[PDB]
Design a protein around this ligand. Structure first.
Ligand SMILES: *[C@@H]1O[C@H](CO)[C@@H](O[C@@H]2O[C@H](CO)[C@@H](O)[C@H](O)[C@H]2NC(C)=O)[C@H](O)[C@H]1NC(C)=O
Ligand SMILES: Nc1ncnc2c1ncn2[C@@H]1O[C@H](COP(=O)(O)O)[C@@H](O)[C@H]1O
Ligand SMILES: *[C@@H]1O[C@H](CO)[C@@H](O)[C@H](O)[C@H]1NC(C)=O
Ligand SMILES: *[C@@H]1O[C@H](CO)[C@@H](O)[C@H](O)[C@H]1NC(C)=O
Ligand SMILES: [Zn+2]
Ligand SMILES: [Zn+2]
Length: 379
């Protein structure tokens, strides 16, 4: 009987949601498991880059998914959330489902996790779902758990992904407590459905389950806008990604573009690529454009017609508002332990340890996770 692990992400689950709303089902999951109250994720704090960091243990400059929208000047290739199936974009790293799939008599399974419908280094999970946001949580849940329960050879690593509370966090903004409370109650119910389902199938006691997320959300406002069209003409540059980290590809002298942009708003930092702060680990990749604009927390970079979005993320990964949480339950995990923080790149070496996989070189520190694990010294 090999170890099994289910990795679950509810997109956009800001850590402090746990302190401001009631999560009876999550509380239950935590009570007999472990909670990391907030996870320091990676810059930029967007969906595709952070999900890949979870499954590779790498910073974004290293795994190469540096935004939800990218342009590679050399190949002329474009990446976006919808247009995300060219392996070119995934192949700078090897995610854990691949390493798991490559072991004899083991399989990986997936239900909607970013990249799991793409062959990466020519390897795809035995079971996966082509991305389709219309597929209900129940269907994702019932299928991924069936696969974990049945399947020959055994499924030992599985992913499960859900688009909320990110989608509604964007719509309402995290400060809209009336509306976010209904969103998050639904998430807690889904976690309840997950636990009920594990108990029904007899998986609850032997399956390792991690419930986590990619980033948080912060409130945006009409009083906090930076309009690039009021600062620089379109002819000067091509916009690769917009807000709150704008990726700017100059059409003319980069110096001329930089001089305009650095005098646009005191509520963003304007960086030549080579001046991007080292703390972000967001420089050493050709997919990072010659200039980036980083808006301060709660500020939005806009064009004349950019639509309103009351919540957003992407900002500085040191901001608590951008941090997700992590919870876990199962034979590898202690019962009733709470820990303050780990880094999101630390999840990978922990998962490899649970599954008995040799990790690829990575930027995580296994030591940070030892207090969560039953076989490990906790200092
Ligand atoms: C994050 O981990 C990656 C993987 O080990 C590191 O990437 C290496 O970087 C060194 C630079 O010292 C290169 O010589 C290696 O060839 C790289 N290896 C791979 C597989 O990319 C990266 O340096 C780490 N990041 C930090 C900030 O330490
Ligand atoms: N495979 C996929 N294809 C298309 N869209 C996706 C996929 N996975 C996630 N998404 C959506 O893309 C969003 C990324 O935008 P953001 O949340 O602003 O980072 C996610 O929150 C999902 O709603
Ligand atoms: C879920 O599983 C059913 C049968 O168990 C399968 O027919 C269906 O295609 C799956 N849904 C997906 C892959 O979205
Ligand atoms: C997405 O899922 C829904 C529900 O299963 C289905 O009706 C729809 O046809 C799917 N879209 C594609 C492109 O398969
Ligand atoms: Zn996300
Ligand atoms: Zn989002």
């Amino acid at each position: 009987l090999p170890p099994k692990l289910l990795l679950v992400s509810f997109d956009g689950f800001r850590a402090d949601y746990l302190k401001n709303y009631e999560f009876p089902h999550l509380q239950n999951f935590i009570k007999e498991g472990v909670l990391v109250e907030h996870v320091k994720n990676v810059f930029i704090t967007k969906t595709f880059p952070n999900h890949y960091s979870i499954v590779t243990g790498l910073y974004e400059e290293s795994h190469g998914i540096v935004a939800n929208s990218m342009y590679d000047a050399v190949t002329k290739k474009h990446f976006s959330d919808s247009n995300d199936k060219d392996p070119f974009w995934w192949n700078e790293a090897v995610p854990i489902w691949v390493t798991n799939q490559l072991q004899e008599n083991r399989s990986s399974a997936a239900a909607m996790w970013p990249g799991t419908d793409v062959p990466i280094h020519d390897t795809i999970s035995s079971y996966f779902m082509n991305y389709n946001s219309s597929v209900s949580f129940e269907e994702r849940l019932n299928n991924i758990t069936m696969w974990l329960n049945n399947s020959n050879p055994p499924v030992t690593f599985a992913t499960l992904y859900w688009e909320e509370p990110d989608a509604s966090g964007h719509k309402y903004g995290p400060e809209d407590k009336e509306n976010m409370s209904r969103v998050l109650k639904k998430i807690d119910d889904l976690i309840g459905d997950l636990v009920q389902r594990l108990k029904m199938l007899g998986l609850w006691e032997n399956l390792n389950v991690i419930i986590t997320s990619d980033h948080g959300m912060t409130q945006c406002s009409q009083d906090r806008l930076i309009n690039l069209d009021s600062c620089i003409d379109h002819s000067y540059y091509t916009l690769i990604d917009l807000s709150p980290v704008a990726a700017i590809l100059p059409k003319i002298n980069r110096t001329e573009v930089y001089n305009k942009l650095k005098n646009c708003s005191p509520h963003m930092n304007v960086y030549l690529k080579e001046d991007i702060p080292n703390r972000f680990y967001y420089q050493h990749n050709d997919r990072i454009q010659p200039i980036i604009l980083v808006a301060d927390e709660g500020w939005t970079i806009v064009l004349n017609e950019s639509s309103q979005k009351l919540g957003d993320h992407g900002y500085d990964n040191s901001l608590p508002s951008m941090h997700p949480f992590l919870a876990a339950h199962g034979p590898a995990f202690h019962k009733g332990y709470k820990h303050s923080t780990i880094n999101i790149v630390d999840i990978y070496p922990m998962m490899c340890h649970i599954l008995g996989l040799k990790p690829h070189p990575n930027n995580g520190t296994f030591g940070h996770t030892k207090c969560l694990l039953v076989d490990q010294w906790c200092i």
